[PDB]
Design a protein around this ligand. Structure first.
Ligand SMILES: *[C@@H]1O[C@H](CO)[C@@H](O)[C@H](O)[C@H]1NC(C)=O
Lengths: 124, 84, 50
């Protein structure tokens, strides 16, 4: 399997604002592996943020971010999008675009590839 | 005193230090940076490395001690093993 | 995922050799400058055990 992931978006915003992130996948893989986003803070570990499938059928968001983050899949350009709204200070960290190559995601544990770190800072 | 062997003489993974002093021999494989002119200066002050990263060997033993001295060495390396 | 294995290297190893360099692999003419991307992959992969 050879998957290349590209991450777009990020930057400096204010609390309560809105933003759009995106990841694009290229190459070949075993199957229609799902796509997700993780978030790592300086001095802490990576945290599961969002997960979506390859056909927009299963949505999975972390409990601490339930009903707030949104993830969608495009229809004609293969690029997954992550819509972000009403940011707070705890959202200032580096997001990563994670790929897992299997049909059904029982858990987010099996990771085969990562993505370029996108810095998202939320401050006054 | 010594012979700082190694590879591309940068971070890499190889900065063999074979420094010898009046106390003992301090054979040491650790990888580090070594400024730009390692010189040593009672002369018991050695200033070679700046930050040893990881380490993978140690050794201590007795030192190697007109003109009234002449020393020879044949440094060789076969299949990893180093012969002095 | 604490077990890792190197995937890309410019040249083969001599017998009983150890490599721990983590520099970004170069697969094309353009330098990677320590950044992943096209022709710029991390030399070591991970091991999936289930
Ligand atoms: C030595 O190697 C490890 C990985 O094997 C590296 O992460 C580390 O930075 C190196 N040693 C130190 C403590 O700098």
């Amino acid at each position: 399997s050879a998957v290349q992931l590209q991450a777009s978006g990020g930057g400096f915003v204010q609390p309560g604002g809105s933003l759009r992130l995106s990841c694009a996948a290229s190459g070949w893989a075993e199957t229609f592996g799902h796509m997700g986003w993780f978030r790592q803070a300086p001095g802490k570990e990576r945290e599961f943020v969002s997960a979506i499938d390859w056909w927009d059928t299963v949505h999975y968001y972390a409990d601490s971010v339930k009903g707030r983050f949104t993830i969608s899949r495009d229809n004609s350009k293969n690029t997954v999008y992550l819509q972000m709204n009403s940011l707070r200070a705890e959202d200032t960290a580096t997001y990563y675009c994670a790929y897992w190559d299997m049909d059904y995601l029982q858990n987010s544990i099996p990771v085969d590839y990562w993505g370029q770190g996108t810095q998202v800072t939320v401050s006054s | 005193r010594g012979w700082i062997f190694g590879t591309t003489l940068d971070s890499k993974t190889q900065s063999l230090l074979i420094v010898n002093n009046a106390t003992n021999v301090v054979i040491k494989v650790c990888e580090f940076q070594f400024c730009n002119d390692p010189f040593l200066d009672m002369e018991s002050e050695f200033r070679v490395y700046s930050s040893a990263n990881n380490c993978t060997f140690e050794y201590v033993s007795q030192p190697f001690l007109n003109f009234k001295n002449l020393r020879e060495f044949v440094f060789k390396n076969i299949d990893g093993y180093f012969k002095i | 995922y604490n077990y890792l294995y190197r995937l890309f290297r410019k040249s083969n190893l001599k017998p009983f050799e150890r490599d721990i360099s983590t520099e970004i692999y170069q697969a094309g003419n353009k330098p990677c400058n320590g950044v992943a991307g096209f022709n710029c992959y991390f030399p070591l992969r991970s091991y999936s055990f289930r």
